[PDB]
């Protein structure tokens, strides 16, 4: 009457095959990325070849980090940074940028710094600081079993499937991003690169949009 090793040697194969089914989409993702971006650069150089301009497809995803202190904040900017999980300094999260998503970032603009993150930025950001909301319980994401368990409802089971599901703002972006925790970042390593940080970036300050520059900033807040 053993009954013991019957049910536990099934998970070795279960895991090796779910790892083999993770692998396939991860390699497919590297393929996806380089084909899409090399096609973008090639369309730019093709429109330049035959005399015209290929206009960049305006961005569909942006990363946002809040800065100003807990205190001395008007009621509605306070409300909205409470409304985007941004209740701390150097905390940050992503936004699906529709243009309804968009007009709240332009209400918090002097309290945040945001823009368009590279793949590598997002990957380094969710590897080191990616956390999941589980009965709120702020779990750290040590391996893919947990996004399998929470989001086996979306065909999303790899950490890089999740990366892909936001860097492409996938059809179930929101059910994934809300699951993600806000990102407790530190203060930037090489300072803030600007002496007084509460002026607009355009004004030699540090708040506003910095489109491809938050990369350099957020990689520094590792």
């Amino acid at each position: 009457a053993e009954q013991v090793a019957a049910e536990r040697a099934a998970r070795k194969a279960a895991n090796k095959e779910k790892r083999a089914i993770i692998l396939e989409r991860n390699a497919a993702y590297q393929k996806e990325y380089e084909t899409a971006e090399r096609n973008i650069i090639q369309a730019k150089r093709d429109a330049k070849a035959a005399g015209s301009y290929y206009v960049e497809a305006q961005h569909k995803l942006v990363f946002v980090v809040r800065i100003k202190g807990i205190n001395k904040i008007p009621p509605k900017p306070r409300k909205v940074l409470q409304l985007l999980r941004l209740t701390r300094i150097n905390s940050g999260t992503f936004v699906k940028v529709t243009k309804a998503t968009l007009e709240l970032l332009k209400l918090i603009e002097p309290y945040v710094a945001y823009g368009y993150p590279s793949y590598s930025t997002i990957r380094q950001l969710v590897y080191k600081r990616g956390f999941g909301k589980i009965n709120k319980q702020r779990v750290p994401l040590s391996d893919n079993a947990i996004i399998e368990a929470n989001l086996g409802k979306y065909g999303i089971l790899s950490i890089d499937d999740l990366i892909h599901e936001i860097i492409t703002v996938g059809p179930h972006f929101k059910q994934a991003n809300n699951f993600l925790w806000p990102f407790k970042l530190s203060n930037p390593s090489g300072g803030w690169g600007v002496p007084r940080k509460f002026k607009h970036f355009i004004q030699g300050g540090s708040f506003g949009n910095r489109e491809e520059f938050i990369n350099k900033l957020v990689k520094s807040m590792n």
């Binding site: 390699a27 590297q30 093709d46 330049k48 005399g51 590897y127 080191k128 040590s142 950490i159 890089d160």
Partner: protein
């Protein structure tokens, strides 16, 4: 009881992301994209250095 971070402690870089090790064979970060010989048009560059 503790979180170990990838990009260091390379063993846990494979607990997630197995494709990682294929990544190490093919440079993939040093992927030599193969060249194209397209020359920009002229009506574009004329205006690009137009006063």
């Amino acid at each position: 009881v503790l979180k170990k971070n990838p990009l260091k402690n390379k063993q846990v870089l494979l607990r997630l992301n197995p494709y990682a090790k294929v990544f190490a064979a093919e440079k993939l970060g040093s992927k030599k994209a193969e060249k194209t010989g397209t020359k920009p048009a002229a009506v574009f560059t004329e205006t690009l250095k137009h006063d």
